[PDB]
Write a protein that binds this ligand. Structure first.
Ligand SMILES: CC(=O)N[C@@H]1[C@@H](O)[C@H](O[C@@H]2O[C@H](CO)[C@@H](O)[C@H](O)[C@H]2NC(C)=O)[C@@H](CO[C@@H]2O[C@@H](C)[C@@H](O)[C@@H](O)[C@@H]2O)O[C@H]1O
Ligand SMILES: CC(=O)N[C@@H]1[C@@H](O)[C@H](O[C@@H]2O[C@H](CO)[C@@H](O)[C@H](O)[C@H]2NC(C)=O)[C@@H](CO[C@@H]2O[C@@H](C)[C@@H](O)[C@@H](O)[C@@H]2O)O[C@H]1O
Ligand SMILES: CC(=O)N[C@@H]1[C@@H](O)[C@H](O[C@@H]2O[C@H](CO)[C@@H](O)[C@H](O)[C@H]2NC(C)=O)[C@@H](CO[C@@H]2O[C@@H](C)[C@@H](O)[C@@H](O)[C@@H]2O)O[C@H]1O
Lengths: 40, 40, 40
């Protein structure tokens, strides 16, 4: 079932975003692969 | 065109995040595949 | 290093979600492919 995200962080060394979830014992995360780049 | 996300939720049964969007009639969502796991 | 997401926007022409990152000059983003659709 859907649960809120407590915070989003991204890492430009590992190219992953991590969502810390409000669920259960508090130690669950969602993680996915991302492009990370500088824009103009 | 990029539109704000009003709400982000993640679901460890379907392994999807859903972003609720601020656009038009208010019923648009984004959805992507994610890993969901416990940490120590 | 993990850095916080300032804000999240999604685009239903490019089918990309963009996370604006709190880092350096403020022009860094994380981007990933997404479904975008209308709900009922
Ligand atoms: C002078 C300096 O340190 N400039 C920074 C860049 O090094 C850095 O780019 C990353 O550099 C590492 C080290 O070689 C590479 O392995 C990465 O692939 C580079 N990442 C990208 C996306 O180009 C950039 C970006 O910083 C990275 O991403 C940020 C969002 C943040 O997570 C940082 O912690 C991370 O190092 O920053 C320049 O200022
Ligand atoms: C006893 C109990 O209900 N324990 C929970 C686990 O079942 C659950 O892990 C999921 O279990 C389902 C069905 O048993 C598996 O098909 C899934 O693959 C499991 N998901 C994961 C990520 O391992 C966990 C996690 O709960 C899930 O993810 C949460 C973030 C939330 O979205 C839940 O609604 C979702 O069911 O929780 C245990 O406590
Ligand atoms: C009359 C009108 O302009 N209606 C809008 C639709 O055009 C639009 O659906 C997109 O339509 C383009 C071509 O017009 C297609 O190539 C895309 O595949 C369609 N996208 C989707 C997801 O169906 C919709 C949705 O608008 C898009 O996504 C939004 C969330 C936002 O990012 C918009 O800037 C973007 O155009 O909106 C109708 O009103």
């Amino acid at each position: 079932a859907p649960v809120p995200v407590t915070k989003l962080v991204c890492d430009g060394d590992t190219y992953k975003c991590t969502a810390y979830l409000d669920y259960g014992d508090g130690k669950w995360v969602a993680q996915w692969d991302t492009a990370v780049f500088h824009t103009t």
